[PDB]
Amino acid sequence: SDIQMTQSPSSLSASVGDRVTITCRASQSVSSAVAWYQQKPGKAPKLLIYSASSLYSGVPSRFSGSRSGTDFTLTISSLQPEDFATYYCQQSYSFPSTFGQGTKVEIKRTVAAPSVFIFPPSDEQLKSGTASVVCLLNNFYPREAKVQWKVDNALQSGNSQESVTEQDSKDSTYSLSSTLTLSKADYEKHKVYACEVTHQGLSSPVTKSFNRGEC
Amino acid sequence: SEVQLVESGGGLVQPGGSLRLSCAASGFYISYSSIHWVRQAPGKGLEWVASISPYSGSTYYADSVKGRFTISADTSKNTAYLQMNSLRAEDTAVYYCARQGYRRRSGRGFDYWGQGTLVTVSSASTKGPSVFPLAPSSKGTAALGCLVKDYFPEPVTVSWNSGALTSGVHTFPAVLQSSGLYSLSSVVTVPSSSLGTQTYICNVNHKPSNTKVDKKVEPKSC
RNA sequence: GGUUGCUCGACUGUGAGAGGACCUACCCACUGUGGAAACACCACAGGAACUUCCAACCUUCGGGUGGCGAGGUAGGGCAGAAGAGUGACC
16 A cells, blocks of 8 residues: 655745745655655655654754654744746655655745736748747736736737746746738737736736837 | 766657657766655656666666656666657656655755756657847847747757857747747847947857858848 | 493484574574665674573682574484393492
8 A cells, every 4th residue: 555645735826935844744754755846847856854853964954854653844933035846856766766756945026017028920830820929927926917918909818828937046037929810811800909917016907019010 | 076967869759759868977976875756747847767776687667657768777888778669649758867865965856957858749740940130229228039939849959159148148948839830039238329330149059950040130221 | 130330332312481502614694883885895893672591711619701594414412222242339
């Protein structure tokens, strides 16, 4: 039977200099064969704690492990901005080894309104019959934002896709790229393409826009 | 320290097929340590895969791969291998290699990791990205970028001006076009003045296709 | 013929709480620390406790020293001994 590592919270937003506690509960006694890792996006994991309480060589003293029965708890006394990371527990007391589902941490800063620009599809693209309109929301916070495409003042729906950067660990902010996509024919049917951003830092919804053709 | 781990042998693979991932050890000899594979499906979490034991070559498997994967090591070559047969879609992941440290120092922690090789089990075929330019405008800084459209599989890489332009650059994570292909775009912001005098090229590399594209990004032509 | 000493002894024994600690070698084991060591291989320390014992060594005979894997397989130790003798004595 597999020892389960059940770790909560799934996610944690907190202020710089807060105390953050992440908990992991092993379905069976695993002695102190528990270790804690810090993984930042696209990087390989890094080791933090290794005998449920023992701080790995070089790890800042603000990190610390702890066992209580089958409850293991990592603990950062004061968040630094760099500590933005998904944290995992692992049990290595039996085979198969087992990891927690991990806990994504976020920085917290004052409000930053998005910078907004809009990009009309490039001339090379339209030759090949495709037509992507891109809208950029730059260096804002908090990430919760609402982008709305209007084509000749028609709200679009189901033809936009967006992706978001992680928290720039120096900036503690976000950027978003919402991309409207159409056939060349659908593009050539409408003059005005507008991108309507609503964000907490903006007291009023900011719209950048263009007309098809203007030089 | 010189302690390093280098995975290799991943990539696009049809369902039902096989791969053999390699892990190349640099700063230490693997014969004195326990060596483990750990994978991570995209934006999911860490999953333990297999491990082999020093001095005994005892091998231990995750049950989701048991009998389809095999772990091993060649002392002489200071390499550890992982033979993956009869792969399925969910085998898709970055497959990491890690050294269980020396007990006196780090207990049973995994104290060195590779950068992991990405394994992409699918039948859909490789395509390289059309690269389009996101031209700037008026209104003291503006933004320009590149659109990396309709490629597969991940990853592409974007650098600006051959890596000389690093500051202010946001390369968005690909999203999955309904074509199954990937699209993404990269953007940098620059003070408006540089427009007329500063050459701005993004550099786009999609190794799965062997596609390298350099797109000079210039302002509105008129 | 008793009786009883003396010697060679087939062979059986080593008895577990109201009572079992003899030695050695191989194998096979059980438990923890350590060996760049989660298992395997290695070295080492240990077989719950209180007790029981001295087959072992030392003694001034007061007592002391040392000693437990109830695993097999063999060689011995110690205890009997059926049988052989063999005396003394009646």
